[PDB]
Amino acid sequence: MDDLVFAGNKALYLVLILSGWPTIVATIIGLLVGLFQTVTQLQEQTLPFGIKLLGVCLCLFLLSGWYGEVLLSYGRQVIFLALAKG
Amino acid sequence: DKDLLKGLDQEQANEVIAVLQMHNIEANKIDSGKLGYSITVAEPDFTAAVYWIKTYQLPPRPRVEIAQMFPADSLVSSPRAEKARLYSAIEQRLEQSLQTMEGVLSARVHISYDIDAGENGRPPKPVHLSALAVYERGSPLAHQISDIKRFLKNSFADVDYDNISVVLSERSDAQLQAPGTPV
Amino acid sequence: DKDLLKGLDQEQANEVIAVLQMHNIEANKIDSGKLGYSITVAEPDFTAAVYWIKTYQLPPRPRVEIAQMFPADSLVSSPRAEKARLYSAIEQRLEQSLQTMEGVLSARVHISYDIDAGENGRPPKPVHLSALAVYERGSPLAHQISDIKRFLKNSFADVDYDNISVVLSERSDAQLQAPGTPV
Amino acid sequence: DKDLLKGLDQEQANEVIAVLQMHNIEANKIDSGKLGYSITVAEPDFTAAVYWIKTYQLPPRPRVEIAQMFPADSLVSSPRAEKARLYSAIEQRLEQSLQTMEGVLSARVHISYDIDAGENGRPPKPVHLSALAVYERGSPLAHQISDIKRFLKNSFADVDYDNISVVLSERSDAQLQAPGTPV
Amino acid sequence: DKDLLKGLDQEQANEVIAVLQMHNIEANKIDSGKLGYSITVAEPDFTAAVYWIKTYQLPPRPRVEIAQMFPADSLVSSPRAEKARLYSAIEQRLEQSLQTMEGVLSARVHISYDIDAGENGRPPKPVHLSALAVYERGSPLAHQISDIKRFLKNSFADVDYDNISVVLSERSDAQLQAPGTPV
Amino acid sequence: VAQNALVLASPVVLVLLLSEVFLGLLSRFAPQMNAFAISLTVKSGIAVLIMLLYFSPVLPDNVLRLSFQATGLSSWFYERG
Amino acid sequence: AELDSLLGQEKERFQVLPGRDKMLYVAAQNERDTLWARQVLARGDYDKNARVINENEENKRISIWLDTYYPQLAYYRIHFDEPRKPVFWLSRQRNTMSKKELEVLSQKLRALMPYADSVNITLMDDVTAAGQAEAGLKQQALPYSRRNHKGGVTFVIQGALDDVEILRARQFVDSYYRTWGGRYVQFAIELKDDWLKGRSFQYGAEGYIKMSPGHWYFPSPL
Ligand SMILES: CCCCCCCCCCCC[N+](C)(C)[O-]
């Protein structure tokens, strides 16, 4: 039982960790560009998209490795919990 | 006079004075308020006072309790932290109850934390306890261990007399006469 | 005169005076208001007073109750925290009731906190209780244990006389005469 | 005059005065308003008054009721909290009813809080009750236990005479003569 | 004159005066308006007044009723709260009706709150009732219990005479002569 | 069934509404800020964060309080013959 | 300023006696009164020597002295209803003494109690004591078991007792002890998860047979 609760909790915890950094940078870029467009009055609306695409892709390059190490370790763990009973 | 220590707490100063006096060293306690207490001795006694401060590793460190590692002011708690706080409060409440028995001066208690695991999928292990106590002079220690064991046994869901360790000791000789002043 | 302790609480000072008077040490309590109470003694008695303060580990601490670990002002209560508060309130209400029996001066009570597992999906374990009490002089303790056991047995859904431990003691000799002043 | 206690409330002050007068200690109660009550005694009686204040653990604490652990102000209420409040109100209402019986001076009552489980998915346990009461001198206690049991039995859906514990005691001797003033 | 109590409510003051007069203590009630009522006695009677105030636990607390735990002010109510308020109102209305019977001076009633479980998924249990009443001197109590039982039986859908407990008592002797003033 | 579901989901809906109104209020001082697009970046993280806290009661909530029981058959079925 | 003027407005509550050691003795009836008196002396409201005494304290002190100089004397209790002429109850069967020895014992007691003028020694019957104990239990209708020893008798009362039984039992024992003291009969009250209240039987082919008493007991399932 507690193994079930633990594994289910951890799933949500990993979602949170992995998704957190891209969504942070997409937020910060959204705020900065929105402010800049009030500091100098320009009514463009694709500029956020153009910048935040580069912003998100860059950090996907950076974190490409840790993403695979975390998921491998988790998969091995849950396969053990499922099968290794005696 | 030479300065030994500065910025002490009240509870650190009185313990230092007690240990110096026991070895016949006359010491002086001075209060500087926001700067705390200072302790001074005469030159003929300076060497000895230094050697005893080293031997007892004074001033004393503050008392440690497990609840301090998991402050209740957190915004999140795991089951593990909650369970730890629980046991870290039962231990203290038992020590405080034992000090009320007949002629006990002070005591200490320890509980086996299973909390470091969930005992996941396993029948959870039984509890173990340990206690130390200091009695007044002329106490029949042998006859008093039974009472303590009896009292502890029923404080928990499953405890065996075999799993309870109790160690007792008598108070040392009283330090009543004052130390002599250096000539 | 030498300062022993400062910034004491009222309840925390009257205990020190009591313990010193018992050993024939004349002490004085002074009030500084926002700075609290101060305790002072004569020089001839300073050494002894220091030794007793150490030996009894004075000043006393605040008393602990488990409900202090799981404050009701939290954002959320786990079932564990609710269940703990509940038990930690029943304990206090029982102590306050026992003090009303004839002759009892003070008492303390403990319950087995089975809550250290949720019992979720487990058959819940039986309750265990322990009690300590102090009696007026000339009380037949043996004949009085029966009343206490009888009273506690029905306060819970499932308790056996075998699972209740009770320890009783008599009041010490009264300290009525005042200590002598140093010559 | 020496100060024993300050900042009392009315109901603490009167209990302390009562307990000192019983032991032949003449005391004085002074009212400072926003500062509360103060209690003073003569020097010849100071030592004794200190010893009794320690022994009886004065001043008294406030009464504890389980409803204090589960304020209705919380944004969420589990079933557990509501059920707890309910039982904690029934207890108080029964106490107040017993005080109306003939001869009873005061009483206390306890109920088995099975609310420490939700009984979710389990058949609900039977109720257990305990009562303590004090009687006027010259009351046939044996003949009066029957009345109490009879009255309590029908106050709940399922109670057996076997599950009701009742303990009775008589009032102590009246303290009518005033204590003597120190010479 | 010595101050016993201050800031009393009118219904508390008249209760204290009644209890003191019964024991031959002449007391005085003073009104300070927004500050409430004050009670005073002579010095020769101070000691006794203190001992009786302790023995009766005066001044009386306010009366408890279960509807106070479940105020309607909230936007939400479970079935449990509504059902509780309903029973807590029937109890009061029955007491008010019994007071109108011939000879009855005061009464009190209790109903089995089966709502301490939902009776969800389960058959509802039968009702139990208990009542206490006080009569004028010279009343045939034995022949009057029948009437009460008959009246209460039909107030609920399913009640058996076996499940109704009734306890009756007579009024004490009248206190008509005034107490004597201290010399 | 619908009642039980709403009663249980409510805590998350509330916080996500407060979040979006908070952003809309903030937008008043910087009207070029796309407060809508910001909320899409934020709300999924908020959702998972909050549900992670109230996750553990999910085990007892369903296992007992919602499961059907043999005692209820009496009320849902009867014999017409 | 006499001492009686200092003890209070009620006068009969205390009794003041002079003693041969040139000291005043204040006789009290109970602990509460004893402390009400002791406070006066320890406060120093009186200037000469004085002492406070009661029946329980003196019984204890005398027993302590007997333990040393008469380590084999069988006796019950000393009554101080008239504090100037105490009564000492000795067993008739268990003691062999001559008249002379009894007189000497009397004189030594008088030396221990400087406030008493003489001590009366009376011989009591053990069968009488034991009988009055058993009759008091039957009269209350408590369940019990009796056990006899060369030097004493025990009554054991045990099981799942009711509140009424507990109350009546404790009242009776408290009454008897005041009269005969603890030295010969012991009453033991112990609650158990046992509805038979200490009875026990074995089922054989001949049906039930009553078991002898003992320590172990069968906790009731019922
Ligand atoms: C619009 C892009 C959505 C991508 C979602 C998946 C993110 C992980 C991509 C794999 C790891 C990073 N990398 C650089 C190797 O691609």
Ligand SMILES: CCCCCCCCCCCC[N+](C)(C)[O-]
């Ligand atoms: C969408 C989750 C993040 C992208 C990574 C998914 C796991 C891909 C497999 C990882 C393999 C790691 N590797 C190369 C060390 O074996």
